[PDB]
Design a protein around this ligand. Structure first.
Ligand SMILES: Nc1ncnc2c1ncn2[C@@H]1O[C@H](COP(=O)(O)OP(=O)(O)OP(=O)(O)O)[C@@H](O)[C@H]1O
Ligand SMILES: Nc1ncnc2c1ncn2[C@@H]1O[C@H](COP(=O)(O)OP(=O)(O)OP(=O)(O)O)[C@@H](O)[C@H]1O
Ligand SMILES: Nc1ncnc2c1ncn2[C@@H]1O[C@H](COP(=O)(O)OP(=O)(O)OP(=O)(O)O)[C@@H](O)[C@H]1O
Ligand SMILES: [Mg+2]
Ligand SMILES: [Mg+2]
Ligand SMILES: [Mg+2]
Lengths: 334, 335, 334
DNA sequence: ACTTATCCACAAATCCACAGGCCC
DNA sequence: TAGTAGAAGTAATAGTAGGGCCTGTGGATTTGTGGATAAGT
């Protein structure tokens, strides 16, 4: 059907960032339409939302062959809705999508900006919840911050349980890697898994891609996977914390001035202008507080910091090659 | 069909710079949607990405006549998408591009700056991957550095297997010359191909152009192909070593027996300044960096000092054949 | 149509400096899209490139009346492309220029700098090449020295065969003056033949212009053509085009500075004063654009030329010597 | 003690993306 | 057996990439010019 055999509760590795979502989803799977009817789950990219939805559908269909579970995306929903109302066959669209025992609608944020598709989904939600049919909704952002969503639809989103998924930590990253390797059926040393999980922490997808690249490169070189071969396979794939000290050093380097005279009390232009540019960069790049940066600037007052920042912003608002130099400095810092 | 009969896995030549991509493409063509469902090949220009895409298409079509293999470039995708939007046949566009066993989309970087087409390709990718359909994506730079690409699409690109093509080796350039000569069915002595391969190193396209020009000039003059005729034909036709300041000061320090760190020292002695003055001269002569940067590389020395040293060295070499010879030797060493 | 019938494969003669291009073009005409599919003819002005392109078009259309052969200059291509974008007829533009059997594009050099049209020409090239169509391109310089040409388009240009056109020699001039004499059906003495052959060598357009002048003089004088009449006709009535190269070479002759260093980034006063003088003179007596002057002089900005002209005007508004020298050089170049 | 080579402040020729007005 | 004259109809999408440049101030910026300064002789 429309579900994924690889996406099930057994393949899901439970961790700190997905324990709550997993438990809520498992409750919904065990007691459809009776425990948490409007379930809403949101998170980042490559975190397990569609995996969890397919696991819910798999569990319900496995335990209840007389269950009409339908998984779909928001894009497919709008496509089918508009096609139906263009073909003048809307009655069949309604008949299909109001009689589902479980509705697993995905990436609901796509509905933002489509007023009539939002209205049709609103009526679909009302009809499905009025008859005790399970509703699971997935998003990338909490329902509050989905734009162009009406109060009615948002309030239906918020009626039941709302969960969240957080990026995974090291232990569960290594656990996911071990599970994927064991499912594939190859023995990989634990040092390789630790190496990969350390040097790629973005989501499942780049982690899986790194594992696939390691395996493919090792198979090509017909050598057993080790830490050095994994390093060579991931040489071409592999952010830094910005530091006020590093910013000052860089700016002083470009603008022909030493390091010890940043805290000097000299008011010469040739030193003040690079210092003002460096402090403007620190203000508009780092989250460091104004008292802290002033302390790093030899105890300069917040009023003086304000005046220098405003002067630099206004002066840059009239020219472009200072912006070019700032862009070059930022590229160097990256 | 839309595929090239010239591009095939047979006509492709395995080199050290493309063995990985050839193996990945061959495995994908042997087992579509079952080995590496999203496959992402990136590299330089004229390096053999469309060759591999057409080769995969040919293999899949030949080994499965009933499979729908569709090859297109990014600009064709955008043109057809926008045309469908204007003509209200977007349903036809979706039904055409969401129901293919194998999709082969070329030069995906062109989508940078096309937000609606990026969304449409995102959804097409999602549908094809859900339905266990093979997707092959081509580009010149990895998805990390394609600008204005949504993180969802980037994460999809990074999901499967990403492989790269690197510029060809001398041996494989000679092999490509041999293969092309055999394909067009005339014989060329080995030294001519060796000369062409040594002289031309950018990508396959310039190599093919050089071979075509040599063959055509030989046919025109009605004389047999040799090294002198090849040179005459190619009269007007493995890396550009970009200079760097650390290299130039390393060369001058090895020439005049001064350590690296002392280059940033404040000493004003003659035996220190004169190498530094000629370093200023050669830096301004060769590199495109500003005199602010030339003062950066010596720990913040003034552009005025740099230019004063420059004109001093110019005046010196105006009457110093020994200095001219030394600077020429420095140029030869750095080149 | 758009093809000049004066140029045809019959009236072109195998010269010493153009036999290679003639043979390549003839092979292309005999076997379109099969022999040398991307054809690239680079050479000086008035040497036979347009003649060869028109001959190729004539041959292909004659031996295949159903073939779609289109010839155009790059100016027309750019203008049509821009107007298609402006009027939202870009679909019609693409339909016109991607479904032709043979395309003959003229003067590809000045596309240098005009971006977004060398991407549409890139896509047109790729469409024609993949659909097994024929492309002929004309230029005044080898592709490796066409400025601001993206590496992909450069590789596309160099993928094919490159033909060098050399200025004609004595025998070629003699042959084509015989050709024009047979074309226009008048008889001239061998003395005038040799005269016009050997004492006139800039380009064959100049040769034809001298022919026209001699014919007009003979018709006006109502006397038989002879060496004395030819010499009297060619003693000197033409407004010379004030070119940037002429201006800069006059400036260099007057100031003792070479020409190649004008491309150098060096901007000492002794060479910057002649540079800004040349910029002001070009702005004064050239209809050419300041960005074109900058590109011919190192790819500099138009605002640079504007500032140089403003500074020169300010200087001449105060110093009489500068005005006198400017008047002297203007009279010299006039 | 002075003058000479060297480093730094300062002003001007130059070059950048950027506002605008055609006008197609 | 040879058979008549039939009306009043809805609520509806999501939607693209794009042209140089003729001009033209504003302002950085990257230097040369001049001045300030240590030293060494
Ligand atoms: N905890 C986990 N354990 C195992 N696999 C996981 C886990 N979290 C995510 N994954 C992997 O995520 C992959 C795909 O991610 P998924 O589609 O579930 O997330 P998503 O990007 O949030 O979803 P969506 O498609 O709704 O945008 C699956 O193949 C699955 O193996
Ligand atoms: N081993 C090889 N690798 C690459 N190209 C080869 C090889 N052997 C022959 N060629 C020829 O050299 C040309 C270079 O490949 P290709 O044209 O695909 O470069 P590309 O820049 O990747 O193409 P595109 O720009 O369309 O992506 C091909 O047209 C091909 O016919
Ligand atoms: N080598 C030549 N021999 C004889 N005639 C020539 C030669 N070159 C140019 N001509 C004459 O010039 C005319 C047009 O060709 P020409 O070389 O002027 O094209 P062109 O200058 O390249 O034009 P464009 O710059 O528009 O491409 C022809 O009618 C031809 O008589
Ligand atoms: Mg989702
Ligand atoms: Mg490609
Ligand atoms: Mg021309």
């Amino acid at each position: 059907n429309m579900l994924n055999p690889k996406y099930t509760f057994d393949t899901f590795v439970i961790g700190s960032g997905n324990r709550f979502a997993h438990a809520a989803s498992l409750a919904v799977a065990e007691a459809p339409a009776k425990a948490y009817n409007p379930l809403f789950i949101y998170g980042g990219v490559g975190l397990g939302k569609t995996h969890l939805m397919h696991a819910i559908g798999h569990y319900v269909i496995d335990h209840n062959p007389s269950a009409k579970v339908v998984y779909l995306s928001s894009e497919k929903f709008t496509n089918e809705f508009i096609n139906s109302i263009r073909d003048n066959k809307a009655v069949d669209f309604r008949n299909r999508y109001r009689n589902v025992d479980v509705l697993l609608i995905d990436d609901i944020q796509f509905l933002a900006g489509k007023e009539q598709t939002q209205e049709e989904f609103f009526h679909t939600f009302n009809t499905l919840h009025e008859e005790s049919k399970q509703i699971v909704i997935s998003s990338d952002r909490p329902p509050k911050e989905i734009p162009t969503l009406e109060d009615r639809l948002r309030s239906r989103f918020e009626w039941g349980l709302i969960t969240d998924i957080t990026p995974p930590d090291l232990e569960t990253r290594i656990a996911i890697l071990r599970k994927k390797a064991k499912a594939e059926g190859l023995d990989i040393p634990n040092e390789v898994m630790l190496y990969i999980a350390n040097q790629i922490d973005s989501n499942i997808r780049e982690l899986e891609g790194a594992l696939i690249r390691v395996v493919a490169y090792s198979s090509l070189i017909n050598k057993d996977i080790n830490a050095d071969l994994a390093a060579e396979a991931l040489k071409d794939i592999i952010p830094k914390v910005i530091t006020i000290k590093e910013i000052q050093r860089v700016v002083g380097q470009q603008f022909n001035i030493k390091l010890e005279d940043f805290k000097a009390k000299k008011r010469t232009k040739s030193v003040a202008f690079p210092r003002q540019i460096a402090m403007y960069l620190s203000r508009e790049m780092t989250d460091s507080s104004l008292p802290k940066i002033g302390e790093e600037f030899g105890g300069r007052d917040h009023t003086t910091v304000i005046h220098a920042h405003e002067k630099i912003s206004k002066l840059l608002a009239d020219d472009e090659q200072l912006q070019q130099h700032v862009k070059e400095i930022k590229e160097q810092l990256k």
